[PDB]
């Protein structure tokens with residue numbers, strides 16, 4: 001039932017979990033500590049199929065540009081909603097970058113066009129324009145929500161790619177919440193993953 | 204839940220994530236008779252994705268010729284006993300040969316299958332007793348040798364499996380496994396199952412064979 | 415073989431592996447024209463579609479992001495979208511034509527709806543350049559751009575998955591924009607695999623517009 | 625392009641879509657410089673950006689013993705079409721003495737060969753008998769040994785193919801499938817030389833392909 005807030009209005013919420021570290025042990029042996037030893041053994045040599053028997057269901061609220069990257073992970077199940085909020089980058093988001101415009105003003109200019117686009121959308125809607133058409137004016141930082149069911153193996157591949165300094169900061173934050181939850185429900189698998197398979201650097 | 208299939212096989216439910224409501228939750232993307240109304244609506248309109256949020260893990264013991272057919276379903280996860288490092292055989296019953304006129308009595312056919320299986324197995328043990336590695340010695344064992352595997356699959360894929368295996372076109376032996384699979388599916392997801400039969404099931408036996 | 419879609423989009427055939435006979439060869443597992451078409455119709459009629467997985471296409475698509483998001487929901491395929499790390503990035507947007515709004519009674523004339531969409535696109539785009547020039551990283555600045563921004567991708571999919579794509583997108587219930595791309599996809603598919611395409615429409619196509 | 629494997633098997637190239645440049649065009653998303661293209665292939669492989677290689681596809685026709693096919697069919701990201709056993713041509717894999725020539729046995733390597741050959745013969749005969757008798761082939765075939773040869777068409781993209789080689793072109797895999805993987809590698813090397821060399825240099829996890837040639 002975990003829920004972690006991300007960005008200004010987003011979140012990653014655990015909906016359900018099937019199995020735990022032992023589910024992988026049971027699959028590896030096809031049965032029902034030497035177990036903690038098996039998990040590391042499987043992880044080191046790359047015998048990842050057993051980890052497919054651990055599944056998670058997440059409910060995610062994220063901006064569309066983050067969701068688009070996320071949806072690139074094909075080995076998972078998705079259900080997106082089909083209620084108007086936008087991700088406004090905080091000023092600290094620009095730290096490290098020397099901008100002509102003070103960080104606060106960048107955050108302002110972003111709020112402004114967002115507000116203008118949204119008002120235009122509302123206007124078109126109020127005039128009878130089909131929502132599917134009017135919505136194309138909305139910006140990429142609009143929040144959407146979706147359910148994500150993914151097994152532990154696919155999830156680790158997701159973390160290898162998004163829990164990395166080379167990934168956009170925003171997606172990293174989401175990947176951090178995903179890892180946090182994965183760690184809570186599968187300590188052994190996660191630790192093992194971190195010790196032998198994790199390719200990123202932020203975890 | 205363990206259901207015996209054939210002479211020594213079985214389908215045993217290991218774990219399950221969610222139920223009919225999981226698909227309802229997924230469909231609405233949030234947290235009585237209207238939920239069941241939703242399941243039906245999704246099924247009759249081809250909105251299958253919500254059902255991917257229901258997942259099962261089965262433990263199956265079946266003859267290799269049946270497993271081979273089963274493993275053809277790629278949208279699932281499998282873990283089977285290693286033929287290399289990890290001995291019962293399926294002997295059809297005389298009744299299995301009912302309907303086909305044979306030159307010899309059904310029990311004769313049954314006896315003969317039992318005969319070769321016995322010879323193959325005896326030869327196998329002989330090879331092993333001789334120092335022959337199992338990965339090599341096992342190649343003489345027949346296709347009716349029983350094997351075991353864990354199968355994790357979501358409800359949408361499980362329904363595709365039923366469309367194909369719980370049908371008269373599939374070999375009788377796997378139909379039997381498909382019936383047990385359907386039996387378990389129905390008990391864990393009654394609304395989805397009824398909706399499935401009513402609007403999307405393409406097979407024939409599940410609409411004739413109770414549960 | 416290229417087809418223009420919307421105002422600045424397109425679907426272009428990049429490569430294709432096999433033809434109708436590739437599904438025949440796979441079905442028979444090996445290696446008379448009417449005997450071959452009969453097998454193809456036979457496979458399609460009984461839902462034996464795996465043989466059609468041995469026909470593959472690679473398309474180059476230029477579409478608005480909102481169309482792309484729906485398209486990318488088809489997981490049994492391969493995609494590579496433009497990033498800017500290997501190729502230059504261009505900025506164009508889908509501006510609906512007044513006709514797109516027919517059948518709908520609007521308080522604002524169609525031409526005025528088109529005008530308003532162009533307006534936001536212009537302002538969103540300029541705010542974007544404003545941010546870039548100010549030293550704001552593109553990854554951050556681009557978040558103000560609208561969903562009608564055109565993007566490009568390569569799409570490799572086999573004929574079976576392709577037919578699933580047409581069943582869902584070449585249909586009146588799918589958004590009009592994606593329908594236009596689906597029609598174009600169907601067309602190239604027909605040109606390269608007429609027997610398979612014919613059979614698809616006769617026994618398996620679930621949609622309506624084709 | 626056909627290569628014999630084991631005593632009666634083979635791997636045959638049926639078709640192929642694209643080449644090394646298919647990955648380059650996909651990574652650049654452009655459908656319009658050997659030095660630079662080769663550099664990009666290596667860059668992609670070195671940094672794990674593997675999706676571009678999914679736009680290179682192969683179709684093979686394979687003949688292998690069922691015990692080998694069962695291992696092969698475990699690779700799910702691919703397309704398979706196998707001969708229907710439920711609905712001619714029965715051959716079996718008989719290990720040569722050199723196969724066991726490395727393990728201490730209590731009988732001559734040649735005896736194992738004869739032993740295996742015997743049962744295969746006995747099982748095959750019983751099967752033919754049952755068939756003649758009127759027993760459906762889907763039922764009579766269950767007495768056939770796992771070394772029976774089957775055939776299938778295999779369509780797989782370059783990315784998935786490399787995962788297959790990682791796992792099967794390795795000393796940890798059974799010797800028999802190792803032989804097939806070597807043949808697969810040979811064909812792969814011939815059609816996509818750059819991707820293959822890049823594969824071996826930055827991503828290949830097995831042993832044999834860096835030891836054996838082509």
Ligand SMILES: Cc1cc2nc3c(=O)[nH]c(=O)nc-3n(C[C@H](O)[C@H](O)[C@H](O)COP(=O)(O)OP(=O)(O)OC[C@H]3O[C@@H](n4cnc5c(N)ncnc54)[C@H](O)[C@@H]3O)c2cc1C
Nearest residue numbers: 275276277278367372373464467490574575702705706708
């Ligand atoms: C009566 C009967 C006779 C049969 N005869 C033969 C035979 O002669 N030869 C033979 O080889 N097999 C035969 N089969 C096996 C048949 O090919 C299987 O149904 C198939 O291998 C597994 O089914 P699937 O594709 O529906 O399932 P899955 O592999 O689980 O896939 C589920 C869904 O995902 C899809 N999908 C998955 N991967 C891909 C992909 N790579 N490309 C496109 N779509 C994909 C499709 O939409 C599919 O319906 C037979 C089966 C039956 C029941």
Ligand SMILES: Cc1cc2nc3c(=O)[nH]c(=O)nc-3n(C[C@H](O)[C@H](O)[C@H](O)COP(=O)(O)OP(=O)(O)OC[C@H]3O[C@@H](n4cnc5c(N)ncnc54)[C@H](O)[C@@H]3O)c2cc1C
Nearest residue numbers: 076078079080082252255359360487488489490582587588
């Ligand atoms: C009018 C309309 C409304 C829509 N509304 C919504 C909405 O509210 N929410 C939403 O999320 N989407 C919505 N969609 C998108 C729709 O769900 C897409 O068609 C779908 O996400 C992509 O199709 P697919 O699963 O058939 O294809 P693919 O992902 O390419 O899969 C092909 C086949 O393989 C299968 N398959 C693949 N992966 C799996 C898996 N992991 N488990 C089980 N089976 C699998 C199935 O048999 C499938 O048909 C809508 C589309 C339309 C036209």
Ligand SMILES: Cc1cc2nc3c(=O)[nH]c(=O)nc-3n(C[C@H](O)[C@H](O)[C@H](O)COP(=O)(O)OP(=O)(O)OC[C@H]3O[C@@H](n4cnc5c(N)ncnc54)[C@H](O)[C@@H]3O)c2cc1C
Nearest residue numbers: 072073074075161166167491493494495497675678783784
């Ligand atoms: C810094 C960075 C830059 C990026 N740049 C680009 C870019 O320029 N263009 C772009 O398009 N994307 C880009 N991406 C997104 C990247 O391509 C995604 O990681 C990918 O689309 C989804 O990952 P996946 O294939 O590993 O995962 P999934 O799709 O979930 O697949 C999991 C595993 O299954 C596999 N697999 C699944 N389907 C197939 C298939 N059909 N064929 C073969 N193997 C398969 C592989 O073994 C894979 O690792 C970038 C990402 C990052 C972090």
Ligand SMILES: Cc1cc2nc3c(=O)[nH]c(=O)nc-3n(C[C@H](O)[C@H](O)[C@H](O)COP(=O)(O)OP(=O)(O)OC[C@H]3O[C@@H](n4cnc5c(N)ncnc54)[C@H](O)[C@@H]3O)c2cc1C
Nearest residue numbers: 049052075153154279282283285698699700701791796797
């Ligand atoms: C030496 C050796 C020993 C073996 N021992 C055993 C054993 O004891 N027991 C046994 O059962 N098998 C065993 N196998 C078979 C092994 O499980 C296979 O490698 C596997 O079934 C097929 O590999 P794959 O997952 O890498 O490939 P594919 O199925 O082709 O998948 C390709 C890539 O896509 C992925 N992927 C595809 N589908 C999913 C999914 N549903 N969820 C998550 N990720 C997915 C991963 O990123 C994957 O690497 C062994 C193999 C070898 C070589």
